[PDB]
Amino acid sequence: LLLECTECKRRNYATEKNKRNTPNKLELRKYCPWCRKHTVHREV
Amino acid sequence: KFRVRNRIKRTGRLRLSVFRSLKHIYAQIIDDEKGVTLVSASSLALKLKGNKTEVARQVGRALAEKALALGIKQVAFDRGPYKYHGRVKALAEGAREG
Amino acid sequence: PLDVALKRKYYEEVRPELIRRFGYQNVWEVPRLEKVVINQGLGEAKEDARILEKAAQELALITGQKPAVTRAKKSISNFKLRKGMPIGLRVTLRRDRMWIFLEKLLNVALPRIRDFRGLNPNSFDGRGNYNLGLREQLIFPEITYDMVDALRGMDIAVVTTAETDEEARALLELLGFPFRK
Amino acid sequence: RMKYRKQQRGRLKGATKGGDYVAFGDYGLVALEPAWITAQQIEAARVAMVRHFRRGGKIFIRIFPDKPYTKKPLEVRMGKGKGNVEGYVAVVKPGRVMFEVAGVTEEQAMEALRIAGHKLPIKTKIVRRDAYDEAQ
Amino acid sequence: KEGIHPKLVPARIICGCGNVIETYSTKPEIYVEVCSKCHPFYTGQQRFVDTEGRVERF
Amino acid sequence: YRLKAYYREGEKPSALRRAGKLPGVMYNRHLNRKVYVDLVEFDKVFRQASIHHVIVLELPDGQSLPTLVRQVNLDKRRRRPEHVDFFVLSD
Amino acid sequence: ARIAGVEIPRNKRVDVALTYIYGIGKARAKEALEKTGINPATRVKDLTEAEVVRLREYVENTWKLEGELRAEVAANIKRLMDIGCYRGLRHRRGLPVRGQRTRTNARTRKGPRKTVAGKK
RNA sequence: UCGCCUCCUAAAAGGUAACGGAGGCGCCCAAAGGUCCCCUCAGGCGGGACGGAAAUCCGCCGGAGAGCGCAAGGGUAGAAG
RNA sequence: UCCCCCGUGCCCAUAGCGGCGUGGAACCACCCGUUCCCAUUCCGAACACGGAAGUGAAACGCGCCAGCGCCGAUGGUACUGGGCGGGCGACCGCCUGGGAGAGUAGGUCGGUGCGGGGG
Ligand SMILES: [Mg+2]
Ligand SMILES: [Mg+2]
Ligand SMILES: [Mg+2]
Ligand SMILES: [Mg+2]
Ligand SMILES: [Mg+2]
Ligand SMILES: [Mg+2]
Ligand SMILES: [Mg+2]
Ligand SMILES: [Mg+2]
Ligand SMILES: [Mg+2]
Ligand SMILES: [Mg+2]
Ligand SMILES: [Mg+2]
Ligand SMILES: [Mg+2]
Ligand SMILES: [Mg+2]
Ligand SMILES: [Mg+2]
Ligand SMILES: [Mg+2]
Ligand SMILES: [Mg+2]
Ligand SMILES: [Mg+2]
Ligand SMILES: [Mg+2]
Ligand SMILES: [Mg+2]
Ligand SMILES: [Mg+2]
């Protein structure tokens, strides 16, 4: 499903596409956001 | 074969091609787009007996002094069979920052 | 160690014997020994928790070297395993480890296969490369009945630096291989 | 017997690889005009010859029908026709040697290859022997 | 030659028939059943007409 | 097998065919001359003596060159030899 | 301790533990244990290795066994299938050989009954 | 049948049609992505305990005929495997 | 200034494969060991480090060979811009310029730069 990474209790959905049966479930990806550079970005 | 060719993944100029023999180590700055070897340095036909890590450091010192002898500061490492290791070219005098 | 007894017998008798046999022209022209590989086919990856990597430790305790699980290249549906992964055990023995393994093999293991009239000297054929199978894996001087669950027959292949088969024949027959004639 | 075929008409233009010489046997039918030689005309001429000189010699059919001749079943135009009305067709350009008879004498060969040319749709020459060769 | 190992301690190999092979293996004390001193050896079969000339004659 | 042949000096192969001449080359690794041998005699020469027998070309200037008839380009349609070239023998 | 071939018995009495070696039965196991000289009722989980090899020197060297015996039995069978003796034929198709009736019986030389038979 | 992709028809730039020929897509992948470092394929010949004639292993010949998630081309090991 | 060797490129098989002999003063490699760095889903086989006891045996270099390969002209057909005709047709013919592919003669196991090391 089309799932968007959020900055951790913050903004900046990062909008990836996960393959939910194959692993998901706290998708964690370091990512550069619009504000406050670099974070953890758990999905949805 | 050692078909490795960490040759042709070098298109930036001033290609420092090394050669780690069983006896010596050779090194030479080649120019690209006009293939002319600019400076070079052997190890055992320059200096110290076959303590090869230290003399491979010393051939690099001598080569970088030869490079600043004609003023070349940005280069690019080579010799695809490298495995960058105890054949050391941890140097000053060449601002590749290698 | 470095003074393997078979290695000493090689370096002190066999190389001058092959020199005085064939009329060689170089010390490196004599057939040296460089490879003893042991393969374990082992198509056993079914359900009900069929682990079967105890045989890897069994082979490691035989030879003295931990074998690698090798994933199947092609997937065929005749035997039901597929998609690469599951099992084939390989170990490769070079110098003194190969020599201590051949000291354990040629003198202790083969003399015993359950009948053992000999080896099969039609088996070299062109390269150096003497290959020989083993029906029962537990002829070796380490592992008897109470360390296994099933019979794990491997096959070894010893490779020489010999261009033909006659040269490797004359090498291994004096290293201690018997044959069938 | 293979790769997908309801293939196009082509065009029976100039003949150079379409026609070299007679290789097998002695005598040979050879075409003088480009035409489509069917499998039915191949079988018809060949069983004219083998039944003319009965239990005779070798009749090499050097052509081979490899082109699906297509015929619509008497209707309008929606796609290619169903294919292979009598079957396949050897595209034959002139100068091509179609049939060769081997070993059998000239009196049976000239009165066999003439029959083959009579069942073929092409005006033909009949060559004797001693054509193009290469060996030293 | 890495971290994991079988550690290959020197090991005499006694046999039953008396031959000792000084080799390298795991489990440094090892003795076996048969090694050399079984090389060309025991009972060979008595042939056909030999036994049938043994059994009877007229 | 002797045979008379002339010297083409680069004069229009289709005009030689119009004349009835069979054009050709006389060639080896020593010489290379375009020729025309007359076809109304070359057919009688060549169907008698094949490519296994040594022809000898007599030229307009004396030369009775030994040769092997090397290759014939047939006319693909309209059956006749269309070009010849002669492997001239070497000494 | 293995004895012959590889055939190792454990935790059993020795004079029937020898029977698991092919070619040794109950009678030879009675005989060639006290013949060498061993108490024939010592459980082989505790058999002295000197007595194991003093037993094995009589086991292997005296009579032929698994392999050299087994193979001569099979070679006797292949020798019997020669041109057609009556005992080598019917080894050749598995029927019995020493006077067995086969009209109803012989399920240990035949099979699995293939019951394809029967009238109407 | 209606959109998209691959050839071909397409006439050696491109484009080009028909209810012309022949196939596919409506996805997938947190490693089948990035980078660093290694390694070479399929096949055939032999030789090898169960082992299919192609499991796994060894040795030669193997320059791409293997692979690249998927159709088809283009490409490609001096990697895209 | 020339051959010898080492790297490094260019043209990309006219230099490749397979042969057939030669090389070891150096160079280069094999080797001798795994303590040292780092190593291999196992294996210092590879990679790497230490060494220099021995050897050119492989590998490589350098020569001869045409067997395979590769290149391959002169011609001449094919094909064809352009023109002009014949053919109810399938298609063909002539002139004008181009002009192959295969084939045949043959050519061919390098050529060439750059920096080192050596008589
Ligand atoms: Mg949704
Ligand atoms: Mg380089
Ligand atoms: Mg009876
Ligand atoms: Mg186009
Ligand atoms: Mg990828
Ligand atoms: Mg095999
Ligand atoms: Mg096998
Ligand atoms: Mg591929
Ligand atoms: Mg798909
Ligand atoms: Mg492609
Ligand atoms: Mg070249
Ligand atoms: Mg040769
Ligand atoms: Mg020589
Ligand atoms: Mg020297
Ligand atoms: Mg090298
Ligand atoms: Mg050599
Ligand atoms: Mg050509
Ligand atoms: Mg040409
Ligand atoms: Mg050559
Ligand atoms: Mg050359």
From Swiss-Prot, chain A:
Domain of life: Bacteria
Single GO term (MF): tRNA binding
GO biological process, one term: translation
Residues in the signal sequence: none
Keyword match Transcription: no
Keywords of the record: Ribonucleoprotein, Ribosomal protein, RNA-binding, rRNA-binding, tRNA-binding
GO cellular component: cytoplasm; ribonucleoprotein complex; ribosome
Entry annotated with the keyword Transport: no
Summary of the function given for this chain in its UniProt record: Found on the solvent side of the large subunit. Contacts the E site tRNA.
Membership in a protein family: Belongs to the bacterial ribosomal protein bL33 family.
Quaternary structure, from the entry: Part of the 50S ribosomal subunit.
Protein's name according to its UniProt entry: Large ribosomal subunit protein bL33
Range within the parent protein: 9 to 52 of 54
UniProtKB/Swiss-Prot annotation, chain D:
GO biological process: translation
A GO CC annotation given for this chain: cytosolic large ribosomal subunit
Entry-linked InterPro entries: Ribosomal_uL16, Ribosomal_uL16_bact-type, Ribosomal_uL16_dom, Ribosomal_uL16_sf
Single annotated GO MF: rRNA binding
Domain of life assignment: Bacteria
Keyword annotations: Ribonucleoprotein, Ribosomal protein, RNA-binding, rRNA-binding, tRNA-binding
Pfam families (alphabetical): Ribosomal_L16 (PF00252)
PANTHER family referenced in this protein's UniProt entry, alphabetically: 50S/60S RIBOSOMAL PROTEIN L16, LARGE RIBOSOMAL SUBUNIT PROTEIN UL16M
Record's subunit section: Part of the 50S ribosomal subunit.
Entry's family note: Belongs to the universal ribosomal protein uL16 family.
Function per UniProt: This protein binds directly to 23S rRNA. Interacts with the A site tRNA.
The protein's name in its UniProt record: Large ribosomal subunit protein uL16
Taxon lineage: Bacteria, Thermotogati, Deinococcota, Deinococci, Thermales
From Swiss-Prot, chain E:
A GO biological process held by the record: translation
Cofactor, free-text remark: Binds 1 zinc ion per subunit.
Keywords assigned: Metal-binding, Ribonucleoprotein, Ribosomal protein, RNA-binding, rRNA-binding, Zinc
Residues that bind Zn(2+): C15, C17, C35, C38
UniProt source species: Thermus thermophilus (strain ATCC 27634 / DSM 579 / HB8)
Signal peptide boundaries: none
Family under the similarity heading: Belongs to the bacterial ribosomal protein bL31 family. Type A subfamily.
Residues of the full protein shown: 2 to 59 of 71
Subunit comment: Part of the 50S ribosomal subunit.
Protein name: Large ribosomal subunit protein bL31
Function field: Binds the 23S rRNA.
Gene Ontology terms: cellular component: ribonucleoprotein complex; ribosome
Coiled-coil region(s): none
GO molecular function, one term: rRNA binding
Keyword Ribonucleoprotein assigned: yes
Ranges annotated as spanning the membrane: none
Necessary cofactors: Zn(2+)
Curated annotation (Swiss-Prot), chain G:
Domain of life: Bacteria
Keywords for this protein: Ribonucleoprotein, Ribosomal protein, RNA-binding, rRNA-binding, tRNA-binding
Region of interest: Disordered: 94-120
Role, per record: Located at the top of the head of the 30S subunit, it contacts several helices of the 16S rRNA. In the 70S ribosome structure it contacts the 23S rRNA (bridge B1a) and protein L5 of the 50S subunit (bridge B1b), connecting the top of the two subunits; these bridges are in contact with the A site and P site tRNAs respectively and are implicated in movement during ribosome translocation. Separately contacts the tRNAs in the A and P sites.
Subunit structure: Part of the 30S ribosomal subunit. Forms a loose heterodimer with protein S19. Forms two bridges to the 50S subunit in the 70S ribosome, contacting protein L5 and the 23S rRNA; these bridges are straddled by the 5S rRNA.
Family, similarity comment: Belongs to the universal ribosomal protein uS13 family.
InterPro entries the record matches: Rbsml_uS13_C (IPR027437), Ribosomal_uS13 (IPR001892), Ribosomal_uS13-like_H2TH (IPR010979), Ribosomal_uS13_bac-type (IPR019980), Ribosomal_uS13_CS (IPR018269)
Protein name as catalogued: Small ribosomal subunit protein uS13
Upper lineage: Bacteria, Thermotogati, Deinococcota, Deinococci, Thermales
Protein's GO biological process: translation
Nucleotide-binding among keywords: no
Recorded GO CC terms: cytosol; small ribosomal subunit
GO MF term (any one): tRNA binding
Keyword field contains Ion transport: no
